[PDB]
Design a protein around this ligand. Structure first.
Ligand SMILES: CCCCCCCCCCCCCCCCCC(=O)OC[C@H](COP(=O)(O)OC[C@H](N)C(=O)O)OC(=O)CCCCCCCCCCCCCCCCC
Ligand SMILES: CCCCCCCCCCCCCCCCCC(=O)OC[C@H](COP(=O)(O)OC[C@H](N)C(=O)O)OC(=O)CCCCCCCCCCCCCCCCC
Ligand SMILES: CCCCCCCCCCCCCCCCCC(=O)OC[C@H](COP(=O)(O)OC[C@H](N)C(=O)O)OC(=O)CCCCCCCCCCCCCCCCC
Ligand SMILES: CCCCCCCC/C=C\CCCCCCCC(=O)O[C@@H](COC(=O)CCCCCCCCCCCCCCC)COP(=O)([O-])OCC[N+](C)(C)C
Ligand SMILES: CCCCCCCC/C=C\CCCCCCCC(=O)O[C@@H](COC(=O)CCCCCCCCCCCCCCC)COP(=O)([O-])OCC[N+](C)(C)C
Ligand SMILES: CCCCCCCC/C=C\CCCCCCCC(=O)O[C@@H](COC(=O)CCCCCCCCCCCCCCC)COP(=O)([O-])OCC[N+](C)(C)C
Ligand SMILES: CCCCCCCC/C=C\CCCCCCCC(=O)O[C@@H](COC(=O)CCCCCCCCCCCCCCC)COP(=O)([O-])OCC[N+](C)(C)C
Ligand SMILES: CCCCCCCC/C=C\CCCCCCCC(=O)O[C@@H](COC(=O)CCCCCCCCCCCCCCC)COP(=O)([O-])OCC[N+](C)(C)C
Ligand SMILES: Nc1ncnc2c1ncn2[C@@H]1O[C@H](COP(=O)(O)OP(=O)(O)OP(=O)(O)O)[C@@H](O)[C@H]1O
Ligand SMILES: Nc1ncnc2c1ncn2[C@@H]1O[C@H](COP(=O)(O)OP(=O)(O)OP(=O)(O)O)[C@@H](O)[C@H]1O
Ligand SMILES: Nc1ncnc2c1ncn2[C@@H]1O[C@H](COP(=O)(O)OP(=O)(O)OP(=O)(O)O)[C@@H](O)[C@H]1O
Ligand SMILES: [K+]
Ligand SMILES: [K+]
Ligand SMILES: [K+]
Lengths: 335, 335, 335
């Protein structure tokens, strides 16, 4: 049938819609913020076109300011007839075409300055254009260096190397029921101050009328000293003991076929080397909760040092377990 | 008359005045910190003016040293005479006017160095000025590039995108009279490790006369596992259960209007993308607190997906609730 | 025989061996990331080689374009003819060899532009090569500055500086057995917001048959207000008191030699100078726990100041202690 309403997909990225938000309006900072955060394949194109366009723009300007003053006419007539007169005190020496203007703009903008096409002092308009081009070039160059430095500072970024298990299992641990899943780390560095949270999403109904459509009740992670902190080195099993205070206290095996259950798992912490905090998410719906399974053991020391066999990360071995809601299991103990 | 003196405006900014603080003065570091943080409308202006003024200043120096050494007179006479006589070993070739001096300064500080106005081995004051100009140009260049790198790093920085409702409410949940409001977000990245702290700012009175005028009293947010943290994707209803420890345990509907209440809401977290901690604040006073109203349900399920209608963000309906102080209901629910 | 497998060695660096991981693809981003994090001995080499290779490559290009055109022939026949028959026909003036091509490439790419080898405006192919060289030089220059900027930024951080004692003790402190070790710091700065966590790695079996290879159990460190936060200026003695739920409850004094134990200590914090969160780890096994000892005092008052004496950091003196398991000292109280 048409897929259900899933609060967050199997890889985070909540499938929500945010409509009717008041339009704050398009800004001029959208362009810049996009420019700073681009892909290399397009950064190295805007970088090239910025130059290749500024050179051309100021080339057109120099070609004009050498057309108006009559410089092209001097270098076209006296260059044939008589070399004397210094070409009648042109604005810029030896600019006599559009290739000349283009090369002069390239020199003044890159700051090569060969010196064959030298700026004279015989017209202030040229001095104006030279000042303009120097300032424009400095600004463009500073901005492009900034972009490349930003791309360099974000070079260690990767995807989320935290992995989960597609199946979450309900089983019996230390006498009671337990909802459990597995989590594992692929990155070489050990995240610092890791933490886990678990939330059941439902549609609650208070006695007095309220109906919160997606109410995210929170669930306590099972742990000896009642904390959230975990030490992720080898893949490990996060558990939750379904007692009289958990919204799964009235969930049985037969009911777990059509059920308004969705368990959100949020794991976050600071990475040791890079130093930027990360958050990973996953979700399980009544399809991926299998009643009466358990996870296999993985670690084993073949010779000396231990070894984690990741080939069986999400495995699940069928086991024998009750078939009644956790409420029954204490309503009729010792059965 | 004047409204009762708030503590933090509903916008979020503090209103207190810090008067009579031993002055430390204004350092020189303020003039640089203010420079690294300017609007582009002014960053570009100072970027232009720094270079323009430096070029003009060192042009003045070059013109002066081309005067004092008797180099302008030699060029003017050689123009008056027939032959230049190698300008008789000038300080700096082909600098015969102020304009030429400006061009030479532009070439020396942008490092264009066309090379028609060279620099000779004659007078060492020229070499001293050249060293000064080189070092000053390098320092100014480095500073401007640093400021532009700062801008390109602060590209992502914006204002607060967190949203608190216009006015809180006080309703009945599970037979308990509790105070609740709504918080939401217009951002895109989930705030990593949010935390919601609530306080009551009220004038206390110790029995031994330790009167405090603005007393900040922490209040505990309702949570099934007793922690502040919240996962914020869709808009949430923050709530506070009024009980024996709650300062609001005496407030009635009719006595609400004439109360010196103020409830301060602080919300902290880390932005996943930009990685910089934030903080939002808001305040409620006895006018905003709507007694007896409760909010409306935003999220709706449709097209097999959830959807949030941000047009109803602040809507609140009136529902029939006890019109008596919390202590009245709690002491004698029916007696 | 072979040393028994460990979990975390005496210097952190978990000694596990993850295998069978579903290996991903190798991306060029890995090459760039390796480039951006390097050792100065290699940063300098890659920096130098980039520029040498680029100068040489474009020297080859310029020499080829001086060969294909009639340039080398013209400048070789001009010397014979003793007349400048090659002033304007040349693709790039005064480039008549490979050494001169190399000099011209250096001038164009470092932006010196001496001007003895000028860029003529005849051959369009040369103009194409010049534009290409300028763009490539700009890109390489920006990349290398970005690498140096990253080096400068992450320059401040250095290696670990937390000192842990070689082996622990099990004393009696305030009428109960306590497992103690000593942690000190050699750094000059302050670990802001430090924290201590203790775990027991051991192979556990459940009544239902779920066997966990290396289970990590959380140990409540002993603090008078039940918190982790430790303030570290003078070396501290971290202690844990063996109560009804500690896994070290039933381990006696005689059979501590052969017992599957391992105590992992993880100490986290935030340094003040650079604000880079750090985590330091260590582990103790059965062979390195000395029953009935206690650490000697280290700090003596010199009547002007206290004076820690780190020479005795790991010293530990033998004292009396009930030579029996922690269960017998309360189930058999008389002892
Ligand atoms: C000769 C000796 C020189 C030696 C230099 C060595 C020292 C420098 C270090 C090497 C780096 C050189 C600079 C390039 C840096 C980019 C390389 C690499 O890091 O990027 C990889 C790019 C593609 O990445 P992406 O699409 O953004 O992926 C998103 C992100 N990376 C992610 O996965 O999360 O993939 C690519 O980068 C593909 C590049 C193909 C095309 C390259 C040329 C483009 C520029 C062309 C400009 C010159 C010509 C233009 C004008 C011509 C006019 C005639
Ligand atoms: C010749 C080009 C041909 C070839 C094309 C080359 C392409 C160029 C690539 C690199 C561009 C370099 C400049 C980019 C500027 C982007 C900055 C812009 O997006 O910021 C917005 C500015 C004004 O916003 P703000 O509120 O004051 O500050 C932003 C604040 N942080 C905020 O978020 O809210 O909005 C503005 O943009 C300010 C406009 C009004 C400024 C008034 C006059 C400026 C002073 C004098 C001009 C100086 C010369 C400028 C040269 C620019 C050309 C490179
Ligand atoms: C007249 C001068 C006045 C101006 C001076 C003022 C300052 C401006 C210049 C600043 C100099 C640059 C700063 C360098 C900082 C020194 C860093 C130093 O640690 O590295 C020197 C190396 C040490 O190697 P390392 O252990 O890997 O270091 C990284 C460290 N482990 C880390 O924490 O990460 O030590 C070694 O172990 C030696 C091994 C080789 C290292 C160098 C190799 C040289 C290669 C090429 C260099 C020559 C360049 C020119 C070549 C031209 C070719 C024609
Ligand atoms: C990537 C770009 C690199 C470009 C390299 C140079 C291109 C030259 C095009 C061209 O035909 O030259 C022409 C200009 O042609 C123009 O006047 C074009 C003016 C606008 C060009 C479009 C800009 C966008 C020739 O210029 P001229 O001034 O007419 O020369 C006459 C003087 N002469 C007779 C002595 C030679
Ligand atoms: C965006 C362009 C930037 C905006 C300012 C630059 C404008 C062009 C400057 C200029 O014309 O060159 C001038 C320098 O110029 C200076 O020496 C001072 C320039 C700025 C000072 C303004 C202070 C008010 C050159 O002086 P001149 O005017 O060429 O004098 C020639 C004498 N004649 C006219 C008798 C032949
Ligand atoms: C504020 C208005 C002055 C405008 C100055 C801009 C240039 C205009 C041209 C000018 O007359 O400058 C004059 C100097 O002028 C100075 O020395 C001014 C020094 C500081 C002015 C700019 C600072 C802002 C140029 O005078 P000169 O060229 O040295 O005279 C030599 C005679 N010869 C030109 C035949 C050799
Ligand atoms: C790291 C610095 C390297 C720079 C070395 C400069 C000299 C190279 C060797 C050389 O003798 O140049 C020669 C060739 O040279 C070549 O043909 C080499 C071309 C390929 C070299 C690739 C690796 C470098 C250049 O001589 P030519 O091109 O024959 O010049 C002809 C005109 N002449 C005969 C009047 C002189
Ligand atoms: C990406 C960056 C690349 C930018 C390259 C810049 C090249 C500039 C050269 C140029 O201006 O055009 C040159 C032609 O040359 C051509 O452009 C003709 C196209 C070549 C096709 C056949 C080649 C063999 C100019 O030709 P011209 O010899 O100056 O002809 C003078 C007559 N006319 C200009 C009045 C028409
Ligand atoms: N569609 C929306 N888009 C963006 N922000 C919104 C939207 N709806 C409400 N808000 C935010 O909600 C806050 C107030 O919400 P509420 O609807 O309770 O206010 P109100 O009583 O309607 O008064 P106002 O006229 O300020 O909205 C404001 O700060 C506003 O920024
Ligand atoms: N060897 C591995 N390397 C990296 N990631 C893994 C590996 N094995 C499993 N995973 C991750 O664990 C999850 C397992 O879910 P999946 O849909 O792959 O079930 P599966 O293929 O039956 O698992 P398995 O084959 O490991 O039993 C996937 O998200 C995957 O990313
Ligand atoms: N005075 C000190 N200065 C610097 N580091 C020390 C000092 N004393 C001990 N350490 C560090 O503390 C660690 C634990 O040493 P401990 O005192 O427990 O045994 P030890 O007898 O010092 O062993 P070793 O002789 O190998 O250091 C050692 O690895 C050492 O690096
Ligand atoms: K940074
Ligand atoms: K230069
Ligand atoms: K030059």
């Amino acid at each position: 049938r048409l897929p259900k309403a899933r609060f967050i997909a199997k890889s985070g990225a909540c499938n929500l819609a945010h409509k009717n938000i008041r339009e704050q309006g398009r800004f001029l900072q959208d362009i810049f913020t996009t420019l700073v955060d681009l892909k290399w394949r397009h950064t190295l194109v805007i970088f090239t076109m910025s130059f290749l366009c500024s050179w051309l723009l100021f080339a057109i300007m120099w070609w004009l300011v050498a057309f108006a003053h009559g410089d092209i006419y001097a270098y076209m007539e006296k260059g044939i007839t008589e070399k004397s007169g210094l070409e009648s005190a042109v604005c810029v020496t030896n600019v006599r075409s559009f290739t000349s203007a283009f090369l002069f703009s390239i020199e003044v903008q890159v700051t090569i300055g060969f010196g064959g096409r030298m700026m004279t002092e015989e017209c202030p308009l040229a001095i104006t254009v030279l000042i303009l081009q120097n300032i424009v070039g400095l600004i463009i160059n500073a901005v492009m260096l900034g972009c490349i430095f930003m791309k360099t500072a974000q070079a260690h970024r990767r995807a989320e190397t935290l992995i989960f298990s597609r199946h979450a299992v309900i089983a019996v641990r230390n006498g009671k029921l337990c909802f459990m899943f597995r989590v594992g780390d692929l990155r070489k560095s050990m995240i610092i101050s890791a933490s886990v949270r678990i939330q059941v999403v439902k549609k609650t109904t208070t006695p007095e009328g309220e109906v919160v459509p997606i109410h995210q009740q929170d669930i306590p992670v099972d742990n000896p000293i009642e904390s959230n902190n975990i030490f992720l080195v080898a893949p490990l099993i996060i558990c939750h003991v379904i007692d009289k205070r958990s919204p799964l206290y009235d969930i049985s095996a037969t009911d777990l076929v059509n059920q308004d259950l969705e368990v959100i798992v949020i794991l976050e912490g600071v990475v040791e080397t890079t130093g930027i905090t990360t958050q990973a998410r996953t979700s399980y719906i009544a399809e991926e909760i299998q009643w009466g399974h358990r996870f296999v053991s993985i670690v084993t020391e073949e010779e000396g040092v231990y070894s984690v066999d990741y080939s069986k990360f999400g495995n699940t071995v069928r086991v024998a377990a009750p078939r009644c809601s956790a409420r029954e299991l204490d309503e009729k103990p010792s059965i």
